[PDB]
Amino acid sequence: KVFGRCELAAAMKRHGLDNYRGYSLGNWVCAAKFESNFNTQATNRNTDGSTDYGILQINSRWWCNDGRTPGSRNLCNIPCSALLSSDITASVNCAKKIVSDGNGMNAWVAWRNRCKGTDVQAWIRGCRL
């Protein structure tokens, strides 16, 4: 599924991401935009044996288990295929854990590159929340 901007914002808000650990909703929408272009089935297979999965491109070395990645920690305790659903719940819950395990949103390169220092509010402006 390829989400619309406002549709994804609403879904993320229903899942409690607005101001989660001090990160406004627009940060999360902006991250998904440039990680995956809102595509829940996006995959990126890296040369190091790991794969990035889903709308938030969560990596299979630390966070989910796909059975083929060396050094898998599976800290979200889910199969990576669960992150390829049209329901974003599993990706949201694992993203929360990624932050809860010490990291900020610096854990997403696309956020560091394309969202940090910008008016992230623009990504939810105009939406019915």
Residue listed under structure tokens 């995959």: 43
Which residues carry out catalysis? 35, 52
Closest of 30, 26, 52, 29 to residue 41, by C-alpha: 52
Q: Note the helical H segments in the chain.
A: 5-14, 25-36, 89-100, 109-114
Q: Return the structure tokens found at 121.
A: 């509010």
Number of H helices, E strands in the chain: 4, 3
What kind of experiment solved this structure? X-ray
Segment (H or E) for 108: none
Q: Return the structure tokens found at 89.
A: 């719940």
What's the one-letter identity of residue 16?
G
Which value in Å is the resolution of this experimental model? 2.0
Distance between CA atoms of residues 15 and 9, nearest Å: 10
Is 18 one of the annotated binding-site residues?
Answer: no
Domain covering 1-129, topology: Lysozyme (1.10.530)
CB atoms closer than 10 angstroms to residue 90:
21
